[PDB]
Design a protein around this ligand. Structure first.
Ligand SMILES: *[C@@H](O)[C@H](C[C@@H]1CCNC1=O)NC(=O)[C@H](CC(C)C)NC(=O)OCc1cccc(F)c1
Lengths: 297, 299
């Protein structure tokens, strides 16, 4: 049921980028290759890298870019925040229509995990409210990107840079700005306390109804403020009226008003699932947006 | 751990649409052959119980509309192999990957590229249940979508989608047209046997927890494969095969925990329960990660 966008259009952009003894992935659009800047670091550098300093000392030819069997000639380089932009001589014919976007926490995106420029897997993630993502990224995955696809247009929203000690991951948009308070230095970093994406739990509960599962529903009802009071108590995000509007289609399709579902969710939070499960999970799932659930139903 | 699909681009480049009359479903275009479910040739008056051989004799090459996008692919031949249609076309797919057709076993996982009218919608990871059904996400027009695994540069095609059952699960064939399980391609009521838990995958998951340092559940004892299997069946778990034991090898080697020792640890979990304890942050035993999947995400 957890569904990623088809990754073919992105696969045709993935290349390998090497500098010294560091190898990671880059994204090749038109005649520019994007990758994490920490590729220019050495072991010593990575603790407190002075990137502008390290970069000026670098030559176009210190960057080996490989697209499969082929090598691409770097003819220029520049830095945009934490992303290194490498101009090359040849354009990627497989470049798709695209745009660069910075997603809000709570929004989901597909990740194409790559190693040495070769696609390995694809999966769905959500930008957590503390701006980490719960990914499956190992050594060599840096430069893997996250994206959405609308019609024929790929929106790139994420580029992977690091793993925190807790096992979650962090990265930047394609402008090179981190999501969250993180920095691209080799230090143990901790995120803010994470919260649960309420509107997504709600979309998912509706999804469970649509699929014939409704043991958690109740006749009770709640106000929006009183629901948010309980939500905040259990480290759930508050629900905005835009969030309620967005749940509309799902309300309609099932005949369960948003606040009815909020009431059901409130009982779940205060009681628990008591052995029962929902769509197979024993925990409330918060990485399905309303749009995700709709598109798949 | 999360459900992780193979990148779909190599399969995207093979998806086309096949139409008979107003009936449109998806096909798989490899070299100069298009593969699709034979029930594309059915009307509605015909789906209750079709006579496929008699429905086909009446068909000609020029009744088949195959399209890659809006571009027509002319059909120059047609045959029926079990429940799949093979349409020979006048153009060899330039995007044809290295590929093979494999028939998988219950328990094995694969990625599905859910397509509508030949356009990819989404990709996700499915497990073939022991009752030969998959817990998919398919709507109308999704038939002919395929399931695959990728090994090196080679796509192994293992599943083509044909139908949904009363209980909401899905059934289909291999790429040679042979159904998985007892089902037939007819618009009739069909129930799958009782589902059981995929033991080999539960074991892979325990290995996965040990690899990550979560090992409270290992005990000092072992068991025979037969004794484990007889106790497993009493808890609605699948018995283990010799192949299951063999595909657990690498994880056994990685951890130094013999397969039958891990079976004894599971046996004790089944008999005594968790006792309020969690494994990989969960009180449920997960059964949709194969030993190959555990490696993909750990190593
Ligand atoms: C890509 O280059 C790589 C992928 C990471 C590492 C393994 N899983 C992943 O997601 N990134 C890094 O290695 C990154 C480089 C720096 C210069 C940003 N550092 C990192 O992932 O480790 C962070 C860390 C954890 C604990 C303690 C510590 F000091 C640092």
């Amino acid at each position: 049921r957890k569904m990623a966008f088809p990754s073919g259009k992105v696969e045709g952009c993935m290349v390998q980028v090497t500098c010294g003894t560091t190898t990671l992935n880059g994204l090749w659009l038109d005649d520019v290759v994007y990758c994490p800047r920490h590729v220019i670091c050495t072991s010593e550098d990575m603790l407190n890298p002075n990137y502008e300093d390290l970069l000026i000392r670098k030559s176009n030819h210190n960057f080996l870019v490989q697209a499969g069997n082929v090598q691409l000639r770097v003819i220029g380089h520049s830095m945009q925040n934490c992303v290194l932009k490498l101009k090359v001589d040849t354009a990627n014919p497989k470049t798709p229509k695209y745009k660069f976007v910075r997603i809000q926490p709570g929004q989901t995106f597909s990740v194409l995990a790559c190693y040495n420029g070769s696609p390995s897997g694809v999966y769905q993630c959500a930008m957590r409210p503390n701006f980490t993502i719960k990914g499956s990224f190992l050594n060599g995955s840096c430069g893997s990107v996250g994206f959405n696809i609308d019609y024929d247009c790929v929106s790139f929203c994420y580029m992977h840079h690091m793993e925190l000690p807790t096992g979650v991951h962090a990265g930047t948009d394609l402008e090179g700005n981190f999501y969250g308070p993180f920095v691209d230095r080799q230090t143990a970093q901790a995120a803010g306390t994470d919260t649960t994406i309420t509107v997504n739990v709600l979309a998912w509960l509706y999804a469970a109804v649509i699929n014939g599962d409704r043991w958690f529903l109740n006749r009770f009802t709640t106000t929006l403020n009183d629901f948010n009071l309980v939500a905040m108590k259990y480290n759930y995000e508050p629900l905005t009226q835009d969030h309620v509007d967005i749940l509309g289609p799902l309300s309609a399709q099932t005949g369960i008003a948003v606040l009815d579902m909020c009431a059901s969710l409130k009982e779940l939070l205060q009681n628990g699932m008591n052995g029962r499960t929902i769509l197979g999970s024993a925990l409330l799932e918060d990485e399905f947006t309303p749009f995700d659930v709709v598109r798949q139903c």
